[PDB]
Design a protein around this ligand. Structure first.
Ligand code: ZN
Lengths: 252, 244
């Protein structure tokens, strides 16, 4: 806590979700659970449903608390500690490859207080044309979402409207454990045949080979649509440049 | 359970030019017994495997961006993954692990779920090395790999690793002629009646149309895929069924 971790502290990236809390949990007890991770930020406890949230000062402190407190006992119950899913986050796409984390953040700060913006890069450190914008409040995210949908928001010279969408937040951490899968009645009949390579001549081999052929055809039709629409977007660009005499002087 | 795995491996960048192996280990002594250590002195970075994922996460959070004889260390998880789809909603993380383990050691196998904990029909399988992941991909592409009784071929694709943490920092952006051209005009809302507005709004319409057309392709092929079971049941015959 001596030196600031950066520009913003106690952000939603610093928020932890804590599940399986005992029924008699108190705010003091919950705060004491996190006492070694510095001064607590906002605390929200759902005593009736056994869960709470806490904001720590930095992402590193939340990472340590999560690693140290996850799956530890509290009065006969194993606490479940996880990063709280971001409640005020947006997906952005159609970005120029020359938009940086800082340009995206500066650009989106006009909609309200911003925590972070990032341009998603591939293994080479090159822009994928997609990014993430994390706001300090849900209204700021709603306004960014509405305004960029209704208007044309441009970040650089080349006119590329930023396309703002809800951020897909899927669980690739816990997934579907065997404990829940077992609760299904058709599960027993499903696990009856072990993983295998289907063999030539069998119905399952023939069905699977035809299925794969349809999937390959679907991939080819999807890639074609992309190409077809890439050409319509290039033709639109050319017609509009001519309509607006983009390379030429003209009074009207 | 399984200790010193590839998920326990940390990359440490911005090491002082005169770093030694004993100095590098001492940096991580807080986190128990070190596993395999390697220092690429040429590029000023090193690797270390710690006992557990929890310990590697703590060491990354405590050591990242901390001074070491003049520079700030860059600590990251060390960067062999396959995307798997067409999974039954019955396939669990454990079944996925059991099944793909025949191709090589499994770092992690997870079924991707939604906020209700429902299978998306997609998963991720991470192997300890690139040849094991290639082996799994080749075998599942060529052959028909099945996980359960109901025949659903697992569709395996190599998972491109994307970075949503470091991203594209302004300092790292190459300041070439395209960067200069792009940065000439600042962020703005375009004005109605300008080329940049009128073109962009019509582009949005084509972009929305592309998404609709993509969705229709998926819907039309989902229908073809669903009818396939009944068509195949009607037409299937064994190799010896009709011989002269
Ligand atoms: Zn044959």
């Amino acid at each position: 806590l001596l030196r600031r971790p950066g520009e913003k502290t106690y952000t939603q990236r610093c928020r932890l979700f804590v599940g399986n809390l005992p029924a008699d949990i108190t705010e003091d007890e919950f705060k004491r659970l996190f006492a070694k991770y510095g001064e607590p930020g906002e605390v929200f406890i759902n005593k009736g449903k056994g869960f709470g949230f806490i904001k720590l000062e930095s992402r590193a402190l939340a990472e340590i608390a999560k690693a140290e407190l996850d799956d530890t006992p509290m009065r006969g119950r194993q606490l479940r500690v996880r990063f709280a899913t971001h409640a005020a986050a947006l997906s952005v796409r159609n970005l120029s490859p020359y938009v940086s984390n800082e340009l995206l953040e500066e650009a989106f700060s006009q909609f309200g207080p911003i925590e972070r913006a990032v341009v998603i890069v591939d293994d080479r450190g090159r822009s994928t044309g997609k990014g993430i914008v994390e706001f300090a409040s849900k209204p700021a995210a709603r306004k960014a979402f509405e305004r960029c949908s209704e208007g044309v928001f441009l970040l650089t010279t080349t006119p590329r409207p930023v396309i703002v969408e809800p951020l897909e937040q899927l669980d690739d951490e816990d997934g579907l454990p065997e404990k829940l899968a077992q609760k299904n009645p058709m599960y027993q009949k499903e696990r009856e045949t072990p993983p295998r390579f289907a063999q030539h001549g069998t119905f399952e081999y023939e069905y699977s080979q035809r299925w794969k052929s349809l999937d390959e055809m679907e991939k080819q039709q999807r890639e074609q649509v992309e190409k077809n629409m890439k050409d319509a977007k290039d033709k639109l660009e050319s017609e509009m440049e001519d309509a607006y005499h983009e390379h030429q002087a003209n009074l009207l």
